[PDB]
Scaffold this active site. Structure first.
Site, PDB file in Angstrom:
ATOM      1  N   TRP A 139       0.670  -1.012  -0.110  1.00  0.00           N
ATOM      2  CA  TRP A 139      -0.146  -0.146  -0.194  1.00  0.00           C
ATOM      3  C   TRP A 139       0.733   1.494  -0.070  1.00  0.00           C
ATOM      4  O   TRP A 139       2.450   1.337   0.365  1.00  0.00           O
ATOM      5  CB  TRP A 139      -0.926   0.032   1.073  1.00  0.00           C
ATOM      6  CG  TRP A 139      -0.467  -0.139   2.647  1.00  0.00           C
ATOM      7  CD1 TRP A 139      -0.254   0.839   3.376  1.00  0.00           C
ATOM      8  CD2 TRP A 139      -0.334  -1.270   3.442  1.00  0.00           C
ATOM      9  NE1 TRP A 139       0.109   0.562   4.462  1.00  0.00           N
ATOM     10  CE2 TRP A 139       0.097  -0.722   4.718  1.00  0.00           C
ATOM     11  CE3 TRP A 139      -0.135  -2.574   3.144  1.00  0.00           C
ATOM     12  CZ2 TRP A 139       0.584  -1.793   5.692  1.00  0.00           C
ATOM     13  CZ3 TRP A 139       0.121  -3.561   4.193  1.00  0.00           C
ATOM     14  CH2 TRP A 139       0.535  -2.809   5.606  1.00  0.00           C
TER      15      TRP A 139
ATOM     16  N   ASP B  45       5.954  -4.859   3.211  1.00  0.00           N
ATOM     17  CA  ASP B  45       6.141  -5.279   4.454  1.00  0.00           C
ATOM     18  C   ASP B  45       7.521  -6.399   4.336  1.00  0.00           C
ATOM     19  O   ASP B  45       7.985  -6.308   3.290  1.00  0.00           O
ATOM     20  CB  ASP B  45       4.928  -6.508   4.581  1.00  0.00           C
ATOM     21  CG  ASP B  45       3.587  -5.684   4.915  1.00  0.00           C
ATOM     22  OD1 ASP B  45       3.786  -4.734   5.647  1.00  0.00           O
ATOM     23  OD2 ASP B  45       2.466  -6.211   4.677  1.00  0.00           O
TER      24      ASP B  45
HETATM   25  N1  LIG Z   1       1.002  -3.705   6.865  1.00  0.00           N
HETATM   26  C1  LIG Z   1       0.165  -5.211   6.922  1.00  0.00           C
HETATM   27  O1  LIG Z   1       1.054  -6.244   6.107  1.00  0.00           O
HETATM   28  C2  LIG Z   1       0.184  -5.634   8.325  1.00  0.00           C
HETATM   29  C3  LIG Z   1      -1.039  -6.200   8.459  1.00  0.00           C
HETATM   30  C4  LIG Z   1      -2.245  -5.379   8.796  1.00  0.00           C
HETATM   31  N2  LIG Z   1      -3.431  -6.057   8.774  1.00  0.00           N
HETATM   32  C5  LIG Z   1      -3.162  -7.382   8.537  1.00  0.00           C
HETATM   33  C6  LIG Z   1      -3.849  -8.455   8.396  1.00  0.00           C
HETATM   34  C7  LIG Z   1      -3.306  -9.775   8.188  1.00  0.00           C
HETATM   35  C8  LIG Z   1      -2.055  -9.636   7.974  1.00  0.00           C
HETATM   36  C9  LIG Z   1      -0.924  -8.618   7.921  1.00  0.00           C
HETATM   37  C10 LIG Z   1      -1.877  -7.535   8.398  1.00  0.00           C
END
Ligand SMILES: N[C@@H](O)Cc1c[nH]c2ccccc12
Ligand SMILES: N[C@@H](O)Cc1c[nH]c2ccccc12
Ligand SMILES: [Zn+2]
Ligand SMILES: [Zn+2]
Lengths: 361, 115, 361, 109
Positions: B42, B61
Site C-alpha cells: 500500500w 512489508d
Molecule cells: N501492513 C500489513 O501487512 C500488516 C497487516 C495489517 N493487517 C493485516 C492483516 C493480516 C495480515 C497482515 C496485516
C-alpha cells in the site's frame, strides 16, 4: 529514492548476543527464539520455531540449531519432527534434518537438546512416551543413532572434558554415561553407583556443570555431585545448602534451569525460596544464593526478582536470569552478583536464555 | 533518531498498520535478518514537517517470519478501503510473497507527491 | 471413579451461541474462533484457523466454515489456501476445499467471507493483489468460479432477497451485482449508477443490510443507500447523520464492522466519535447512535464502550459490540439500547463477532 | 469453584483447565481428543479428608485454550520419574499432539 532490501546480517557482534527461547505457551504453535543484545537490550531478530521449539547455538558460534514439530495442517495431517540449521548471522534457514516422530515436547530445560563437546553431534531427548536419546550428525545432516540404553532416563549432560560423551539421569538414581564413536553410534557405556534417593531426595535435572564434574541440587536443598575426571563416574552427596537459620524458615530451591556454575571460582548459583513444602519446587526465586562448592558455604544471597531460569557466561563472568518475560543481566566476577540491567518484555513465556558462544571452547 | 523513527507518530509512518521493522532488528528501509521484502505494498502520502513537502511512501512489508510483535502501529492518514486497494492497509501486503507470513512493516520513501 | 470422554457436542443450544473471530494478531498463525454463550458468557469451544482465519456459520446453522492459509513449514514451503467445513455442534473438521493461492489475507470484515442466501455457495474475496470473488460449491467440495469481473471492487454483500446474488463495491463509486447460475458460475451482472464520490465522500464497506436494500455510512457521516428490490440496483444519498450541534463537534463514524440494521424497525446502529479528522476512521466508538432510516433522524445515543465492531440478531432484537477483547450484549427491542452484560476476555484481538443463525435457511 | 487452580483435584495441573474451555473436569471440549496417558498426582479432598489419585489427561488436536492456566506441582517429579512429570506434553501419544487443555480425572483413593 529508497528501496527495501533483505539479505542483512544481525547488527550487533556475536559477543553481544543472547537467545531467549519464547515458548509462547498461550499460542504454542508460534514459539520462537528472540535474539537480543545483552549490553543495551536491543532486539536483534528472531527465528520462528513452530510448535514448542527448542534451540541451541553451535559451539563454534556459526549456526543456530532448532528442534520442532510441524504437521501438514497444524492440528491434523502428517507429522514432521525436525532439527533445523540456521545461519547465526543472517538468521536464515539452511537445512532440515528429519527426526523420527518422537522428539520430546516439553518445557525448555537445557538438557533436552544439547550437543557434544566437539560440536559434531546434536544430542536430544525423545519421549513418545517411549524414551531414548537421539543423535544427529551435523556434518551429514542425518539422524544416526537412537540410544536404547537411555530408556528410563532423562536429559543430556555433555561431558566438557571429552569430545563425544554425555550423561543422563536414570530413574534408579544413578547416571548413565554414553560415549559415541566418530560415526555418532554408541561405542561404550557405563552406569554409576546410585547418586541420590529418587523417593527421598529427588534432584532437579539442571546441572551446575564444571569441566570434569557436575553438581545437582535437590528438592530439599541438598547437593549431589558426579565427577567424570576419571575413567568412570564417581558420585557423592548429599551436602546441604542450608544452615540452621535457613532450615528453620524452610528454604529450598525452586525453578527450572535453576542452577549455574562459575567454573573459575567454583561458585554455584541457585534460586531459593522460603516456606518450602510439597509442591513448591517450581516457585520463582525469592533469592539467588551463591555457594562456594569447595567450602560448601554460602558466600552471598541477593533478591531473586522472581527468576525461574538462569545461564552463565564463563568468559565475561555474567549470569542472566529470567522470570518468564524479563531478562536480568548480572556481573558475577565478585561473590556478590551485581545487577547491570533488565531487559523488559524479552519474551511472553520463556524459561530458557542462552549466550552466544565466544571463542570455540 | 532511533527513538524518533520507532514511534508511530514519526512523519513517514502515517499509514502504517503493523509492527515497525526498525523495532524488529531491521531499519526503516531494511528487513530484519531472514525476512523478505514484499514486491507490492500500500502507498500513501505523508507530509514532511522538516521541508513542508508531501512524499509518496510505499509501505512494504517484511515477510516469511512470524509476527515481530514490537512497535505496533495502526495509523490511517489518507488510508482508504479496499475498493481503493493500493491505499488500503487492512490487508497483508505480504500476500504475493513466496511466504506470506507477516513479520513487520516498513515505510519506504518513493519521492515527492503530486500537489 | 471416572473416565475421560470425548466426542461431545457444544453444551448450549445453537440459539445461545456467538462466534468471536480472534485474529491473535501478535501470533497470527494461531488465529481461532471462540464460541460463547451470549446469555451467560460461558466459553463453549473453539475452532483453530491457522494464519489469519476467517469464519462464518452456514445459513442453515449446521456447519461452520473457515478460510485460512497453510504452508508446509509455516514460514516456508508450499502454500495451501483452503475453505474448511466444520460440524457446528461437534466442532470437528469435516472437509477441506482447495482454493487458488490468493484468498484475501486481511482483517475480519464480514464482507470478505460470505455465502449466497441459499447457502449453496461460499462467496469469498481474493487478492493477488488483483481482486476477484471466489465461489465455492459447499456440497461438491469444489472451487467452481472466479468472478474476475469484480476486479477493482471489494467485499461481498449478499442480497438477502435472492438465492444466489451478491453485490460488491467498486472503485467507480458504484456497486456491481452478480447473479450466479445453478452451478455457481456467473450468469448475469450489472453496475449501478455512481452512488458515492470515491474522492470526496468515501464509504465504509460495512453494510447496514436490509432484506432489499443496504445502507452505508461515509468517512464524513453521510449515508448512502443501494436498493435491490428489483433486478436493477438503485442508489441514493447522501443524507447526513449529523445535526448542526453534531457538526460543530466534528462527530464522524469510526470502526470496522461499524454499522447494523434492525430490519423490523428500520433502525440503523453506527459507531461514532467526536473530533473527527483525516485518519480517525478506525477510532473506537465514543458513542453508538441509533438512526431511524425512514425519518433520517437520530432516535438514541449511548456510550460506545470503545467498541469497534458489531452485529445484530433480528429475531431476538439484540446487538453485540466488540472492542477487540470484550463483547457487550444489548437489547435493542426499543429505540434506546439496554446493556445486558459484558463478556470479558472473549478474544485477544477480534474485530468480528457473529450470532449462530436461527431462522432456518 | 472447579474453574480455580486452587480446586482440590487440580493439584498437579500444568496447563489450561478443560472445565474453562467448553469441557468439564472429565470431558474434553468438543472436537478435542482425550489422551490415553497422563501424568498422575495425589490430591487431598477436603470433603472427606482423604487423598485421591488423579490422572491428568489432556485434550488434544486443537490449539491452546488459553483459559484458566494452572501450574500446580503437588507430588510432581522430574522426567526420570516419567509419569509423575508435568512439564511434558501428555498429548504425545495422540494422533495430533497439539495441546488444548488438561483434565483432572479421579482414579480412586
Ligand atoms: N501492513 C500489513 O501487512 C500488516 C497487516 C495489517 N493487517 C493485516 C492483516 C493480516 C495480515 C497482515 C496485516
Ligand atoms: N499438561 C501438559 O500436556 C501441558 C504442557 C505442559 N508443558 C508442555 C510443553 C509442551 C507442550 C505441552 C505442555
Ligand atoms: Zn502536506
Ligand atoms: Zn491428604
Amino acid at each position: 529514492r529508497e528501496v527495501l532490501t533483505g539479505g542483512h546480517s544481525v547488527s550487533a557482534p556475536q559477543e553481544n548476543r543472547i537467545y531467549v527461547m519464547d515458548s509462547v505457551f498461550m499460542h504454542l504453535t508460534e514459539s520462537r527464539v528472540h535474539v537480543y543484545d545483552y549490553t543495551n537490550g536491543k532486539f536483534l531478530g528472531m527465528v520462528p520455531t513452530a510448535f514448542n521449539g527448542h534451540v541451541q547455538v553451535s559451539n563454534d558460534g556459526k549456526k543456530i540449531y532448532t528442534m520442532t514439530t510441524y504437521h501438514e495442517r497444524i492440528t491434523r495431517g502428517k507429522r514432521s519432527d525436525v532439527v533445523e540449521v540456521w545461519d547465526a548471522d543472517k538468521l536464515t534457514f539452511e537445512k532440515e534434518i528429519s527426526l523420527p516422530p518422537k522428539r520430546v515436547q516439553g518445557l525448555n530445560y537445557d538438557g533436552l537438546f544439547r550437543q557434544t563437546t566437539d560440536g559434531k553431534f546434536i544430542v536430544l531427548q525423545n519421549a513418545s512416551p517411549a524414551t531414548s536419546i537421539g543423535i544427529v550428525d551435523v556434518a551429514k545432516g542425518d539422524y544416526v543413532e537412537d540410544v536404547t540404553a537411555a530408556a528410563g532416563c532423562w536429559s543430556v549432560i555433555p561431558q566438557p572434558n571429552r569430545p563425544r560423551s554425555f550423561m543422563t539421569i536414570c530413574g534408579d538414581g544413578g547416571l548413565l554415561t554414553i560415549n559415541l564413536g566418530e560415526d555418532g553410534k554408541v561405542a561404550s557405556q557405563s552406569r554409576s553407583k546410585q547418586m541420590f534417593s529418587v523417593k527421598d531426595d529427588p534432584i532437579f535435572i539442571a546441572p551446575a556443570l564444571d569441566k570434569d564434574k557436575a553438581h545437582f541440587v535437590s528438592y530439599y536443598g541438598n547437593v549431589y555431585s558426579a565427577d567424570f575426571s576419571g575413567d568412570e563416574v564417581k558420585v557423592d552427596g548429599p551436602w546441604s545448602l542450608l544452615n540452621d537459620e535457613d532450615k528453620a524458615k524452610n528454604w529450598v530451591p525452586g525453578g527450572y534451569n535453576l542452577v549455574g556454575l562459575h567454573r573459575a571460582s567454583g561458585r554455584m548459583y541457585v534460586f531459593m525460596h522460603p516456606d518450602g513444602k510439597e509442591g513448591t519446587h517450581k516457585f520463582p526465586a525469592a533469592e539467588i544464593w551463591v555457594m562456594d562448592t569447595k567450602t560448601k558455604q554460602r558466600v552471598a544471597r541477593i533478591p531473586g526478582r522472581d527468576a525461574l531460569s538462569m545461564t552463565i557466561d564463563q568468559q565475561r563472568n555474567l549470569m542472566l536470569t529470567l522470570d518468564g518475560g524479563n531478562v536480568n543481566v548480572y556481573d558475577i566476577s565478585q561473590p556478590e552478583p551485581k545487577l547491570l540491567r533488565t531487559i523488559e518484555g524479552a519474551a511472553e513465556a520463556s524459561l530458557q536464555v542462552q549466550f552466544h558462544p565466544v571463542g570455540g571452547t | 533518531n532511533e527513538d524518533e523513527v520507532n514511534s508511530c507518530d514519526y512523519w513517514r509512518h502515517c499509514a502504517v498498520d503493523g509492527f515497525l521493522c526498525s523495532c524488529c532488528g531491521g531499519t526503516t528501509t531494511t528487513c530484519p535478518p531472514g525476512s523478505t521484502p514484499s514486491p507490492i505494498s500500500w502507498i500513501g502520502t505523508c507530509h514532511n514537517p522538516h521541508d513542508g513537502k508531501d512524499y509518496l511512501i510505499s509501505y512494504h512489508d517484511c515477510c516469511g517470519k512470524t509476527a515481530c510483535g514490537r512497535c505496533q502501529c495502526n495509523t490511517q492518514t489518507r488510508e482508504r478501503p479496499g475498493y481503493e486497494f493500493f491505499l488500503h492497509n487492512d490487508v497483508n501486503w505480504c500476500m504475493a510473497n513466496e511466504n506470506s507470513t507477516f513479520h513487520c512493516t516498513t515505510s519506504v520513501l518513493v519521492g515527492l507527491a503530486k500537489n
